């Protein structure tokens, strides 16, 4: 395996390096080399050592297969097989005023809901798509677009307090605004933008107002069918893409097969990243991205390969999903009530199920203010602090707004 | 600051001051052998443990500090006499003498069971391993589950039928008996492994995940193209327990069931042929660092090690055919091609480009098995045999002989 042999090579450097001002330089470097030696082995996990090993075996076989595919017609048939199988109105006036702020972080999605017959998702999506000229770009007839958009919005539960089309509309608009970050200009392709926005719009479709954990615990059909892994995220994606199958709703029908293939890859990639358990993994990638960030003249970021761009895009959607504490207090406060209401509904579901009440789920026991300060300090702030570093100086305001709201909720703890 | 970057931050100040060959070889080989997600896991682990320290502290604070830490922790941090109806009977019993033998003829087991080899072999395994007593599984419950399971294995499908399931189940049973693996696995780990094998291919439609993705199938659509069949097999396997009098796991504790479900999902997902290289990688690292207790028995400490072995065991059992006797192996080759051919017949009706081995005019049956052995089956079994040496030598020998036989058949 590679790491085993790489460790054996450097271990040999240490043993053969040993074999006044010079002394200071000599000794300072030896313990530094030793520090890096321990830190290599200790920060190593099972899947990290394995990844380098699997990837060498993959590379090695692909060399042998390229050779074999040149031999006979048969060699080619065997190579192709092996390669593919074992290798990877008054309302319309106010709505328009609220929509002036479509590219602004401070848009009030709640008023958008109010002036749009409680259809903020269709309202905001059509607005975004006209703003980004995506309907023209990707040959999407309005008729088809709204047909899809309406069905999508229909499969967002009305009865659910937080994970309703209003949350979807917020993430969609928030993602739209994050894409406009100056630091990321020519950076993404039109299909990448299309993927991102559609990803955001569907990221929570048919959400039943309960956690994956609840679904697993209650042995739900949904858990059972998705083998307890990313049960909801998989379900959202499945609905999102199946809705395209409805009568005159295929918004992607005018893209090439490759375009659709790629878009489907990215959309799956991004919505799966909205699993809150994938949080640390996303934050890890974003931190490494900041560390090795390369910036082209006048401030615009330099993201080469797809791998880099998708890391940014899935982090962008995740950051947009966790945007509420960074919004104005008037907005943020309403999201807090909405989240709690949903949390308490799950608690009621557990009470009659005779299940031990979920942490936060009982309105009788809930602490809220102290909770938001926990949520900010440990999850929201680290994420946004990282994002703001990557996109500096932009998003400095998003952070100050968050920091202020943290202090406000801190000041509310009885 | 992330770890690998922190390492190379010091490693680079060391080299830019040390001034050598073995350091400059590994200077390049550290960075180059580094992927995109191998780098990521080092860091995501650093942050997960960082936060878990902070929450442990916060829990100690108030009743509130505990509610907030429990919330955050759970949300942003991970984790008949024979069983079959028969008049043939006595013949079935003779074939079943070989239940613990690698050379059992599953095809005759099918013959003397009224084509019910899965129920026949499973009931046999469970009586042999005394699992029904161990896990309080009433016979009715067992045969009831077993029959419904066998029913959801397509008859119309040439290779991925209950006969293949029965083969993997019996092959896994035999691999668990490897002397090199004695006290190693718990009874629940054995139960997990055998059940995993029995259901690993349930409701298989006789087509590849690739086909399903390409044809934009409901199955692909609902499983977002990742491990489409493997996820589906598991979903069926576990949903069947919901049938009246079929819950074979009803008498296990909640934790026992929770753990078994974890391992079964873990193992069946590993039967994705695209996970092949990853499985082999883990098995090779396991071999390299293997610790063996007195008189030959392996020493596998934590769950992580045992599950790597168990998933590799089921995978090895799924790719066992070329390591079986030529009489058996030859029949599996025909069966696999028949299904492959039929897979192409579906592509044809769909106007799709016919898959590599999917056409009989173009198929290199013999040259193909030699490719399959040389590149996939032999490396896997060669690794397995190293881990459980000297056991599995017989398997390797049989494999080697059969490879030479198919080599000698190339026109
Ligand atoms: C505005 O609040 C919140 C907004 C959004 C979320 C996400 C939706 N559900 C989650 O688990 C993450 C949690 C919130 O607050 C949490 C702090 C404790 C209760 C929930
Ligand atoms: C007995 O041969 C085979 C038996 C079993 C399998 C597995 C089931 N499906 C797979 O893709 C792997 C493939 C075989 O042979 C392969 C090489 C020639 C064609 C397929
Ligand atoms: Mg989500
Ligand atoms: Mg399978
Ligand atoms: Zn969301
Ligand atoms: Zn009954
Ligand atoms: Zn199989």
Q: Is B203 left (phi over 0), alpha (psi -120 to 50) or beta?
A: left
CA distance B96 to B109: 7
Give domain status of residue A54, yes or no. Answer: no
What are the φ and ψ backbone dihedral angles of B189, each rounded to 5 degrees?
-65, -45
Which of B2, B265, B276 lies closest to A287 in CB terms?
Answer: B2
| Residue B24 β-bridge partners | none
| Axis-axis angle for helices A231-243, A142-154 (nearest 10) | 150
Record the tokens describing residue B228, joined without a space.
């489409």
The CA distances from residue B241 to B235, B260, B397, in Å, are 10, 14, 40
Cross-chain Cβ contact B46/A43 below 8 Å = yes
Considering only CA atoms, which of B103, B139, B129, B46 is closest in space to residue B324? Answer: B103
CA distance A381 to A377: 6
Cross-chain Cβ contact B371/A292 below 8 Å = no
Cross-chain Cβ contact A227/B235 below 8 Å = yes
DSSP A245: T
Three-state secondary-structure class, residue B298: strand
Q: Which residues contact B244 (CB under 8 A, 6 or more apart)?
A: none
> How was this one solved?
X-ray
Cross-chain Cβ contact B371/A2 below 8 Å = no
Resolution (A): 3.2
What is the greatest pairwise CA distance in chain A?
A: 87
Record the tokens describing residue A209, joined without a space.
């107002």
Record the tokens describing residue A118, joined without a space.
């409680």
What are the φ and ψ backbone dihedral angles of A163, each rounded to 5 degrees?
-80, 60
Q: Is B290 left (phi over 0), alpha (psi -120 to 50) or beta?
A: beta
Give domain status of residue A164, yes or no. Answer: yes
The CA distances from residue A199 to A203, A230, A240, A241, A311, in Å, are 6, 16, 9, 10, 14
Give domain status of residue A206, yes or no. Answer: yes
Q: What is the DSSP string of B3-26?
A: HHHHHHHHHHHHHHHH--HHHHHH
* A235 annotated among ligand-binding-site residues: no
Q: What count of other Cβ atoms lies within 10 Å of the Cβ of residue A133? A: 10
**Across A131-264, where does the E strand assignment appear?**
none
Q: Is B111 left (phi over 0), alpha (psi -120 to 50) or beta?
A: alpha
Give domain status of residue A10, yes or no. Answer: no
Give domain status of residue B3, yes or no. Answer: no
Q: What count of other Cβ atoms lies within 10 Å of the Cβ of residue B31? A: 11
Residue B233 designated active-site = no
CA distance A85 to A106: 49
Residues of B within 8 A of A225 (CB-CB) are 222, 235, 239
Alpha helices in B241-325 (DSSP H): 254-269, 276-288, 303-318
The CA distances from residue B201 to A261, B169, B213, B314, in Å, are 27, 11, 18, 12
Q: Is A295 left (phi over 0), alpha (psi -120 to 50) or beta?
A: beta
First to last CA, chain A: 57
CA distance A364 to A27: 61
CATH number of the domain encompassing residue A336: 1.10.1300.10
Give domain status of residue B394, yes or no. Answer: yes
Give domain status of residue A387, yes or no. Answer: yes
CA distance A101 to A107: 5
CA distance A314 to B312: 32
Q: What count of other Cβ atoms lies within 10 Å of the Cβ of residue B155? A: 8
The CA distances from residue A46 to A388, B263, B305, in Å, are 32, 17, 9
Give domain status of residue A146, yes or no. Answer: yes
Are B161 and B154 contacting, i.e. CB atoms less than 8 angstroms apart?
A: yes
Ligand 2 nearest-atom number relative to CA B357: 19
Q: What range does the domain containing B338 cover?
A: 80-411
What's the length of chain A?
414
Three-state secondary-structure class, residue A56: helix
Record the tokens describing residue A167, joined without a space.
């949350």
CA distance B61 to B76: 20
Pocket around ligand 2 at a 6 A CB cut-off = A 85; B 273, 321, 332-333, 336, 357, 368-369, 372
Residue with tokens 């050598």: B20
Mutate to test the pocket of ligand 2, among B275, B359, B368, B372 (most ligand atoms within 8 A of CB): B372
Residues of A within 8 A of B47 (CB-CB) are 280, 283-284
The CA distances from residue A250 to A142, A244, B277, in Å, are 11, 5, 37
Q: Rounded to 5 degrees, what angle do the CA atoms B35, B40, B46 make?
A: 145
Number of domains chain B is built from: 1
Are A326 and A398 contacting, i.e. CB atoms less than 8 angstroms apart?
A: yes
Dihedral sign, Cα of residue A246, residue A248, residue A251, residue A257: positive
Q: Rounded to 5 degrees, what angle do the CA atoms A162, A165, A166 make?
A: 60
CA distance A371 to A365: 12
What is the greatest pairwise CA distance in chain B?
A: 84
Considering only CA atoms, which of B21, B4, B13 is closest in space to residue A28? Answer: B13
| Axis-axis angle for helices B303-318, B162-176 (nearest 10) | 130
Annotated catalytic residue: which of B91, B160, B204, B276? B160
CA distance B119 to B143: 7
| Residue A301 β-bridge partners | A295
């Amino acid at each position: 395996t590679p790491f085993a042999q790489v460790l054996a090579s450097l271990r040999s450097v240490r043993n053969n390096f040993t074999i006044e001002s010079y002394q200071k330089l000599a000794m300072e470097t030896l313990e530094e080399l030793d520090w890096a030696l321990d830190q290599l082995e200790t920060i190593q996990t099972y899947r990290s050592v394995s990844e380098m090993a699997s990837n060498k075996f993959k590379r090695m076989l692909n060399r042998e297969l390229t050779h074999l595919s040149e031999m006979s017609r048969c060699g080619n048939q065997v190579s192709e097989y092996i390669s593919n199988t074992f290798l990877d109105t008054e309302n319309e006036d106010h709505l328009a005023k609220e929509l002036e702020d479509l590219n602004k972080w401070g848009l009030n999605i709640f008023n958008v809901a109010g002036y749009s017959h409680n259809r903020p998702l269709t309202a905001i999506m059509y607005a975004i798509f006209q703003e980004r000229d995506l309907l023209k770009t990707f040959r999407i007839s309005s008729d088809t677009f709204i047909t899809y958009m309406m069905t999508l919005e229909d499969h967002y539960h009305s009865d659910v307090a937080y994970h309703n089309s209003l949350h979807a509309a917020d993430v969609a608009q928030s993602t739209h605004v994050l894409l406009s970050t100056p630091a990321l200009d020519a950076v993404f392709t039109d299909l990448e933008i299309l993927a991102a926005i559609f990803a955001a719009a569907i990221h929570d479709v048919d959400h039943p107002g309960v956690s994956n954990q609840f679904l697993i615990n209650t042995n739900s059909e949904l858990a059972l069918m998705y083998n307890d892994e990313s049960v909801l995220e998989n379900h959202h994606l499945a609905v999102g893409f199946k809705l395209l199958q409805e009568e005159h709703a295929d918004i992607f029908m005018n893209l090439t097969k490759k375009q659709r293939q790629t878009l489907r890859k990215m959309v799956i990639d991004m919505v799966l990243a909205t699993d809150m358990s994938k949080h640390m993994s996303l934050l890890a990638d974003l931190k490494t991205m900041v560390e090795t960030k390369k910036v082209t003249s006048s401030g615009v970021l330099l993201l080469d390969n797809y791998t880099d761009r998708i890391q940014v895009l899935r982090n962008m959607v995740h950051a947009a999903d966790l945007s509420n504490p960074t919004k104005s207090l008037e907005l943020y406060r309403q999201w807090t009530d909405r989240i709690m209401e949903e949390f308490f509904q799950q608690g009621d579901k557990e009470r009659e199920r005779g299940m031990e009440i979920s942490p936060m789920a009982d309105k009788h026991t809930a602490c809220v203010e102290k909770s938001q300060v926990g949520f900010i300090d440990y999850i929201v702030h680290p994420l946004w602090e990282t994002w703001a570093d990557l996109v500096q100086p932009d998003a400095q305001d998003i952070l100050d707004t968050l920091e202020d709201n943290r202090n406000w909720y801190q000041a509310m703890i009885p």
